[PDB]
């Protein structure tokens, strides 16, 4: 606080008295920054200042110039800068002996000095701190307190400021810090501080590493620093070998083998957890880097150019030393644990999982004997290790080689799922879930499908830890059975389904598990509802009455929530009921889309009533309206033209939704509903379309919406033009100019996100124009005379598509939309467009290349356009 | 074939590995809209 106050702390330290004295700080001292450093700069240099008082000064100093938000104290840095006619130059005389005084800790004084120095370095007008620090690293006395506090301050400075600033004297700092990196200093703590400082200085030392002269010595010192007695400098040295690996992989071929290899293998073999964990981290990072390099090499091979970064295959080179020590680590499972601390065995598991992906199919021979032999060990440790390891290697090797192992190990897994231990059952459930999720052909065999289903349905009533896996095991299995349908001749639905006999029992068991009193553990309830949605989605032609029963039950459950929706006492109530209502609405949509047309009629009334009553919600909130809008967006499509009766009550709520631009999530859903979904009303939306068009124009005027709303609005314009058809007059002049003006926007190639965003805007305008032309022309064989109003605009459309064709950063779809837009102009007029096209042959490139495009839409549209054009030019 | 995402090591353990269902619904609805629009456009040929 103050010189008068700090001496009182030395005599009588307290807690309430310090807070009482701190009241005047923010009132006077913070504002009166000048002639306030002087009083704090005359106490803690004195050895008579007790630790308890110096810490109570350092804490308040650090609070005064450090904060969670930087800029509010950058203002303090600016206020401090104006005082540098005394500031930092008077405390030069103070810091030189404030260090390394009294009790053997930095007492947060070094943290205070770091504030001053990180405040100065953005201006760089007073470099003299660097000699003030480096002088006492080679000083004759070299007391451990001074050296350790100085190196700790250097670390603070390196880790606080933006890395770009400190490059002015990087070489000197690097040369100084390595002097304290030597074991020749008798003090052990100085080694700890030196190792800590180097870790944070790697950010900006790039100019030193990029030439061998210093780097060879640096690597020698760092690697020799691992052969050290103290545990803290061992772990810190390995922690400095990692994050050296990630930053400078390219140079490692001279160091990794002779030095890093043996020390890292011995580290993984270490009995103490820390060193083994650091070795696991190192060898995980090296294979992460090799995976990225393999991805880049694949990209270069696809482009045909040689790769710019050749891989050294460190992880792939050495497996016989890695796999056995890795597997043995899994045997040291903690008997009782909270499953939250990063135990070495979990790291070993994730490292082996990464190794499987990086090494691909060479991992199998090294790990197979352990899995085969220890799977039946009476020691539960080895059973857990064998089951846990087997589930990690599922990725990587192709399913052809892994198929026989799964086939001949499935009988063991089912009986392994029941075990006196709990962790064995948990890991068996995890393994079987991943097996059925990743290798569908292995789990689709009927040799053990019935025992597998029986065991799964029996385990669905078990603890949430295994139930959360049995859900998502039923999923990715039901879908695989749906895909592998015995006959799928018609596109409508598979006539028969491998799960047909058990399907109703599966649905009943899922319903019983959904409302368990422990559904919140491991998000069991949400997983169960998602699994139920996936089950209903992939239902067969058969078992429809199970869907009918599910509809009745889910409708009973949907209206049941409406009471607790009102009876709210806490935010968690809102969280839980919002999640429950969203899941209920999604399941109701997914189950309505499946039932027969006739069956939906008897439920539509109650569905719409419940939906409209729920839509009131909290008088408006993005967490509720989206679900209702999607549900209606499905009901209107499934029901068809009968929606006319419900439209009258619903439309004011739609007019609420359209104006919700503060929440773009509701806006896009409402616009989608307004589009082809509401288009099913055909020539009956005419009374309602006026306010809809007004609101859409307003959403086109207000420039606060998300960038993705505009294409949906253009698509809605096109759909409305298609729907109304012959009564777009007094409306076309209002939208044509808007889309004309919008279409000419441009953005550069600095980010390909902007490139494909512009591509979406292009295609959305293109399809809007196609819809407008189709709607104006009508389905009649003769051309309606009202189409003449768009005639003067055609040349701008051709110029716009030519401007699209000028750039070559295309993707799929735009070519098909261009073909569609060109294929109807000939039908519209047939006498003039044949001579606007030929003046600019650029579209012939799109047409001819479309014939060979890689997608059905583009091929069909380009063939149709070419047939339309060629059958009109022949008449000449 | 690689794919997936390089999540931090903390959350990579015993993961369910399922994307959020809410974002999937929007993509599914967009695909449905595109398919319906194409099917309606096919009626004129």
From Swiss-Prot, chain A:
Residues forming the Importin N-terminal domain are: 21-101
Q: Which residues carry this modification: N-acetylmethionine?
A: 1
Please list where the region (Essential for high affinity interaction with RPL23A) is annotated.
286-462
Any single biological process term in GO? positive regulation of cholesterol biosynthetic process
Query: Which parts of this chain are annotated as the region Ran-GTP binding?
Result: 334-419
Q: Which residues form the signal peptide?
A: none
What stretches pass through the bilayer? Answer: none
**Region (IAB-binding) residue spans:** 329-342
Q: Which domain of life is it from?
A: Eukaryota
InterPro entries membership: ARM-like, ARM-type_fold, Armadillo, HEAT_type_2, Importin-beta_N, Importin_beta
**Can you state the subunit structure given in the record?**
Forms a complex with an importin alpha subunit. Interacts with XPO1. Forms a heterodimer with IPO7. The KPNB1/IPO7 heterodimer interacts with H1 histone. Interacts with SNUPN. Interacts with H2A, H2B, H3 and H4 histones. Component of an import snRNP complex composed of KPNB1, SNUPN, SMN1 and ZNF259. Component of a nuclear export receptor complex composed of KPNB1, Ran, SNUPN and XPO1. Interacts with SRY. Interacts with PRKCI/atypical protein kinase C iota. Interacts with KPNA2. Interacts with KPNA7. Interacts with SNAI1 (via zinc fingers) and SNAI2 (via zinc fingers). (Microbial infection) Interacts with HIV-1 Rev and Tat.
State the family named in the UniProt similarity comment for this chain: Belongs to the importin beta family. Importin beta-1 subfamily.
The protein depicted here goes by the name Importin subunit beta-1
Q: Which organism is it from?
A: Homo sapiens
Identify the gene encoding this protein: KPNB1
């Amino acid at each position: 606080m103050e010189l008068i106050t700090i001496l009182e702390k030395t005599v009588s330290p307290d807690r309430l008295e310090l807070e009482a004295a701190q009241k005047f700080l923010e009132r006077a001292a913070v504002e009166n920054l000048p002639t306030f450093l002087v009083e704090l700069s005359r106490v803690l240099a004195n050895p008579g200042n007790s630790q308890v008082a110096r810490v109570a000064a350092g804490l308040q100093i650090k609070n005064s110039l450090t904060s969670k938000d930087p800029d509010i104290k950058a203002q303090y840095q600016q206020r401090w800068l104006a005082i540098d006619a005394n500031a930092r130059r008077e405390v030069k005389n103070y810091v030189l002996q404030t260090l390394g005084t009294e009790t053997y800790r930095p007492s947060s004084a070094s943290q205070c000095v770091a504030g001053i120095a990180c405040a100065e370095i953005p201006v760089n007008q007073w470099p003299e701190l660097i000699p003030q620090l480096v002088a006492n690293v080679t000083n004759p006395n070299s007391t451990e307190h001074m050296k350790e506090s100085t190196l700790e301050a250097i670390g603070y400075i390196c880790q606080d400021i933006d890395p770009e600033q400190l490059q002015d004297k990087s070489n000197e700092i690097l040369t100084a810090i390595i002097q304290g990196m030597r074991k020749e200093e008798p003090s052990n703590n100085v080694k700890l501080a030196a190792t800590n400082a180097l870790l944070n200085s790697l950010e900006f030392t790039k100019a030193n590493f990029d030439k061998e002269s210093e780097r060879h010595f640096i690597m020698q010192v760092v690697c020799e620093a691992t052969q050290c007695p103290d545990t803290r400098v061992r772990v810190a040295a390995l922690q400095n070998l990692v994050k050296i690996m990630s930053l400078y992989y390219q140079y490692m071929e001279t160091y990794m083998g002779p030095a890093l290899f043996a020390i890292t293998i011995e580290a993984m073999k270490s009995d103490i957890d820390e060193v083994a964990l650091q070795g696991i981290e190192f060898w995980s990072n090296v294979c992460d880097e090799e995976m990225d390099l393999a991805i880049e090499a694949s990209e270069a091979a696809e482009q045909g150019r040689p790769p710019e970064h050749t891989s050294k295959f460190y992880a792939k080179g050495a497996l016989q030393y890695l796999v056995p020590i890795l597997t043995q680590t899994l045997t040291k499972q903690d008997e009782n644990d909270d499953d939250d601390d990063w135990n070495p065995c979990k790291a070993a598991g994730v490292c082996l999982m990464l190794l499987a992906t990086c090494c691909e199919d060479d991992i199998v021979p090294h790990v197979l004997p352990f899995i085969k032999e220890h799977i039946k060990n009476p020691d539960w440790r080895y059973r857990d290790a064998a089951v846990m390891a087997f589930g990690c290697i599922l990725e990587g090797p192709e399913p052809s080689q892994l198929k026989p192992l799964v086939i001949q190990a499935m009988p063991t897994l089912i009986e392994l799922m029941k075990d006196p231990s709990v962790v064995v059952r948990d890991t068996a459930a995890w393994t079987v879930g991943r097996i059925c999720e990743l290798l569908p052909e292995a789990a689709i065999n009927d040799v053990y499908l019935a025992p597998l289903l029986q065991c799964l349905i029996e385990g669905l009533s078990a603890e949430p830890r295994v139930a959360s896996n049995v859900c998502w095991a039923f999923s990715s299995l039901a879908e695989a059975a749906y895909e592998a349908a015995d006959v799928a001749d018609d596109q409508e639905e598979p006539a028969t389904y491998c799960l047909s006999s058990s399907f109703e029992l599966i649905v009943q068991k899922l319903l019983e598990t959904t409302d368990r009193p422990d559904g919140h553990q491991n998000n069991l309830r949400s997983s169960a509802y998602e699994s139920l949605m996936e089950i209903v989605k992939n239902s067969a032609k058969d078992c429809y009455p199970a869907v009918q029963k599910t509809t009745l039950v889910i409708m009973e459950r949907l209206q049941q929530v409406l009471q607790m929706e009102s009876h709210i006492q806490s935010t968690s109530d809102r969280i839980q009921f919002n999640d429950l209502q969203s899941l209920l609405c999604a399941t109701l949509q997914n189950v309505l889309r499946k039932v027969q047309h006739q069956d939906a009629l008897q439920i539509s009334d109650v569905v719409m009533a419940s939906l409209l009553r729920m839509f009131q919600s909290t008088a408006g909130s993005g967490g509720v309206q989206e679900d209702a809008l999607m549900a209606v967006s499905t009901l209107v499509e499934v029901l068809g033209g009968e929606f006319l009766k419900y439209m009258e009550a619903f439309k004011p709520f739609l007019g609420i939704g359209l104006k919700n631009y503060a929440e773009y999530q509701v806006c896009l859903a409402a616009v989608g509903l307004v589009g082809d979904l509401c288009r099913a009303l055909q020539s009956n939306i005419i009374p309602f379309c006026d306010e809809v068009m007004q609101l859409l124009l307003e959403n086109l005027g207000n420039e606060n919406v998300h960038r993705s709303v505009k294409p949906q609005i253009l698509s809605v314009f096109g759909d409305i033009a298609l729907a109304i058809g012959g009564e777009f007059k007094k409306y076309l002049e209002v939208v044509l100019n808007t889309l004309q003006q919008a279409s000419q926007a441009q953005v550069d190639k600095s980010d390909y996100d902007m490139v494909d965003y512009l591509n979406e805007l292009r295609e959305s305008c293109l399809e809007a124009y196609t819809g407008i032309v189709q709607g104006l022309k009508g389905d009649q064989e003769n051309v309606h005379p009202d189409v003449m109003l768009v005639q003067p605009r055609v040349e701008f459309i051709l110029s716009f598509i030519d401007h699209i064709a000028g750039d070559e950063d295309h993707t799929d779809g735009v070519v098909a939309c261009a073909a569609g837009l060109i294929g109807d102009l000939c039908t519209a007029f047939g006498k003039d467009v044949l001579k606007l096209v030929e003046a600019r042959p650029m579209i012939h490139e799109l047409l001819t290349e479309g014939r060979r495009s890689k997608t059905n839409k583009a091929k069909t549209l380009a063939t149709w356009a070419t047939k339309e054009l060629r059958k009109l030019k022949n008449q000449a | 074939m690689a794919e997936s995402l390089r999540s931090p090591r903390r959350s990579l353990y015993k993961l369910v590995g399922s994307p959020p269902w809410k974002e999937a619904f929007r993509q599914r609805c967009l695909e449905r809209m595109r398919n319906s629009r194409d099917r309606l456009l096919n009626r004129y040929r």
